[PDB]
């Protein structure tokens, strides 16, 4: 057929339904895998990658094809499907850095990406990955001039909350102290670190403030019901 998109559409419904039981073709599967790269819809590419057979050779071919592509999210998803926690974390960090450099991701989108990255880190020897992610975030915050300072502070607060919910974690907090050793590697200005610590403490106090009011309202309602 002298039209690639017609072949793509024909092969779409061929493998869309898993009802196939007697499959004998092999060249067609490879052709479909190779020509799926011709699809320019990144969102549809991610949707297709959400559900697939994902053979080991097929996974390797998909990773090789996506190496040239800029779809870092697809690579991270493939790594997660491949149980590559470190690779997925690295891909997520690279995607976050690219979004920050572009300066087009929304605040809500940035928060969603940070939440997804925190969930992926918690999924995973995860202490080393968390330390590396914290170091990368600190380096990105330092390199980026002050706009993204609020985003960096929010990311730091989210990382602290995740570390607290992991158990600080005792020695993991010492790992954070070991991360402080990497801070000695950074050797940043004392004023910036003091300001960041003060902001974190103020945010923690503000977050804890509303819990008392919520508990008081709940207790009043419970007493009235009783």
């Amino acid at each position: 057929v002298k039209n690639e998109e017609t072949q793509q559409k024909y092969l779409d419904k061929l493998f869309s339904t898993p009802n196939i039981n007697n499959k004998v073709d092999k060249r067609l599967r490879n052709l479909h895998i190779e020509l799926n790269c011709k699809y320019k819809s990144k969102r549809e590419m991610i949707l297709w990658l959400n559900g697939t057979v994902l053979s080991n050779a097929e996974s390797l071919q998909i990773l090789d094809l996506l190496n040239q592509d800029s779809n870092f999210e697809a690579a991270a998803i493939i790594h997660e499907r491949l149980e590559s926690f470190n690779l997925a974390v690295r891909d997520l960090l690279s995607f976050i850095e690219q979004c920050l450099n572009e300066g087009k991701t929304n605040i809500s989108t940035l928060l969603e990406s940070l939440r997804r990255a925190f969930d992926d880190c918690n999924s995973a020897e995860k202490k080393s990955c968390w330390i590396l992610l914290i170091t990368f975030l600190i380096t990105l915050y330092g390199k980026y001039p002050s706009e993204r300072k609020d985003l960096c502070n929010k990311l730091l607060q989210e990382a602290f909350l995740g570390l607290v919910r992991s158990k600080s974690g005792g020695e993991f907090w010492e790992i954070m102290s070991s991360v402080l050793e990497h801070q000695d590697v950074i050797l940043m200005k004392v004023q910036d670190l003091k300001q960041l610590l003060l902001n974190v403490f103020n945010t923690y106090k503000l977050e804890r403030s509303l819990s008392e009011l919520i508990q008081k309202i709940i207790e009043d309602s419970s007493q009235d019901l009783v």
Binding site: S108, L111, R115, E158, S209, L210, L213, I217, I218, D220
Partner: protein, 191 residues
């Protein structure tokens, strides 16, 4: 339905979540728009306002809030230097906790405006203006625009601090106070 039932599904998660607390703030705004003036609720209405970086969501509340605790549009006169300012206490958001929370952030510049709306705090207004807001000329003017001669505790409490910046004006004020010249004054906002 009951309010706490609605509030229960919120909270729990304290992630930045602009949508969640935006919806909570809208629900509280609609609740306070018509009736149900629970003392705690409005306090929470302030806290979430401090949680967000919005500013116009606070002054508008001050603009259309009655001194006696009625939410209605139209700025009108109030019983200044009266029972509402000296004897009557009424009910509203806890100023001390709210003031501390505001001072925690850097939004304390407009807090001086919020101090006027809140009653009492006769000796706290000078402290907020002098220590925090600096500008000793403004503090001296406020002390001149203070209440009737019965309002002498602030002078006896902060004369030592006042006499460091501008002794001449402080000396004149002290001489006027001690010489029987206790007449009031209008209020507005090297020798």
């Amino acid at each position: 339905v009951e309010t706490s039932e609605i509030i229960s599904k919120f909270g729990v998660k304290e992630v930045p979540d602009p949508e969640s607390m935006r919806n909570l703030a809208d629900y509280l705004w609609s609740l306070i728009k018509n009736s149900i003036s629970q003392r705690d609720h409005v306090t929470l209405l302030l806290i979430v306002l401090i949680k967000l970086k919005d500013v116009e969501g606070i002054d508008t509340f001050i603009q259309h809030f009655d001194r006696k605790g009625i939410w209605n549009e139209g700025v009108v006169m109030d019983d200044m230097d009266d029972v509402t300012f000296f004897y009557s206490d009424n009910d509203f958001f806890d100023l001390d906790l709210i003031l501390e929370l505001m001072k925690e952030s850097d939004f304390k510049r407009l807090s001086y405006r919020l101090a006027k709306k809140y009653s009492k705090d006769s000796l706290i207004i000078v402290d907020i203006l002098l220590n925090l807001l600096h500008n000793p000329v403004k503090a001296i003017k406020y002390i001149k625009s203070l209440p009737i001669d019965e309002t002498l505790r602030c002078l006896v409490t902060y004369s030592k601090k006042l006499l460091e910046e501008s002794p001449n004006e402080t000396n004149a004020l002290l001489i006027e106070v001690f010489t029987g010249k206790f007449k009031p004054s209008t209020f507005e906002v090297r020798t």
